[PDB]
Amino acid sequence: ATYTLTLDKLGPTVNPTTSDAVTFTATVASPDSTTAVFFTLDYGDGVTAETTRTTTGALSTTPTANLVSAGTYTVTYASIGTKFVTLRLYDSAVAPGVLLASKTVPIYVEDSTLTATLLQSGVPRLNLAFSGFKGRVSSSTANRADMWATIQLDTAPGVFESSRIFIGIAPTASTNYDFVIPDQVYNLEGAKTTVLRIYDAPVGGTLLRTFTPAAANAVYVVDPSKYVLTLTVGPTSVTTADQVTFTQTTTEVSYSASATSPILQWRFNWDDPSVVETPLAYPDALTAASNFPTTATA
């Protein structure tokens, strides 16, 4: 009489807010008891009661395919915070049957009143302290309570949430309140899904908001040593009367690590006080939205 219950939220992919409905996914796998049991789902909101018992069918070692279908199992939460959903398995549809098994899953309901965003001024460097991160919060309601922020560098198993940093009160409504983040050191070259979590308590509590940058502008850690630069200038040994020629076409920049990379501005300085260095400019035939090329480009 062993039962393995897997419960999760199929939708939405992100943590649900107050308004959006939540749909669940539940599977049951019995290693030895191949029979039929009745499942009930409690949403834990308090307003809605426990759902009626419903049959599961003949169980087996492999889990049943989404025992909780779309149906009317969706539920929207009127309050933010940590809710608990419970899937319970009983022998008989009548009440009160024998409670064969129970499983509990926590759902985090953020609030739509507060919008949090994370902006990075620069591009992070591998194994180098990056201090370009910045957080911003805007609350539609006025007099928002004092907040705290944590930043998770990546979703990799080894990465952990950072210690919470204090974010002051946000009295004025519908305004952008700004704060800084302590410098974070990355460990792997490539794209990372850095996330920002705004909490209402320093030691733990409700999850006010979770923000993740769009895949169009995602955090990318690049190795400075991986860049390849081929600079061609005039003759090395000359006098003050000679002419030193720097060829833009022959001079080339590239990034050998990967095809996808954030773009960078190339700037050239003659190391002479009389003439200032060239202004910032992208490589040839590249715009701001474009990616830094891998092949050799002028």
Automatic annotation (TrEMBL):
TM ranges: none
This protein's name: Tyrosine-protein kinase ephrin type A/B receptor-like domain-containing protein
Organism: Chlamydomonas reinhardtii (Chlamydomonas smithii)
Full protein stretch here: 43 to 340 of 1987
